[PDB]
């Protein structure tokens, strides 16, 4: 569709076929207090091996909604803002983002996130994030 992904991808994601299980221990849970109350997130820190720069993959504990824009920025470190806006627009018209006043960025349900993970070559990392415990 109206889509073209960035050219350079985080070397962390060269192989989409690796088993995710060894990654699950590295997730962390964190509670964030919002005006309407606390909510729990599961986060996985992904350090690009060559720029040494860390990004968080993030998941809501209650319904496993995953931040698609966090996935995008970890996958494509040298992406322009126009490239990001283009793909987030794509996610809107082709997947089913959730709407949530409290969190920034575009979040999507688990099955949508795994569809993106195939496109971004991040399937082991989203699988580990989704299978991680919140407790």
């Amino acid at each position: 569709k109206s889509r073209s992904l960035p050219a350079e991808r985080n070397p962390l994601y060269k192989d989409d076929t690796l088993d995710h299980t060894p990654l699950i221990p590295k997730c962390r849970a964190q509670v964030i207090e919002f005006p309407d109350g606390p909510a729990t997130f599961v986060r996985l820190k992904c350090t690009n091996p060559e720029s040494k720069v860390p990004h968080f993959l993030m998941r809501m504990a209650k319904d496993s909604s995953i931040s698609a824009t966090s996935m995008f920025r970890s996958a494509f470190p040298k992406a322009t803002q126009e490239e990001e806006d283009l793909e987030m627009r794509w996610i809107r018209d082709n997947l089913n983002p959730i709407e949530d006043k409290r969190v920034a960025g575009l979040w999507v349900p688990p099955a949508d996130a795994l569809a993106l993970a195939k496109d971004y070559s991040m399937t082991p990392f989203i699988n580990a994030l989704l299978e991680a415990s919140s407790t």
Partner: peptide
């Protein structure tokens, strides 16, 4: 240790950076 990243995670969640 893991507390070092609490603040930047929460700011990314709430404000995107």
């Amino acid at each position: 240790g893991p507390l070092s990243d609490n603040e930047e995670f929460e700011n990314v969640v709430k404000n995107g950076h």
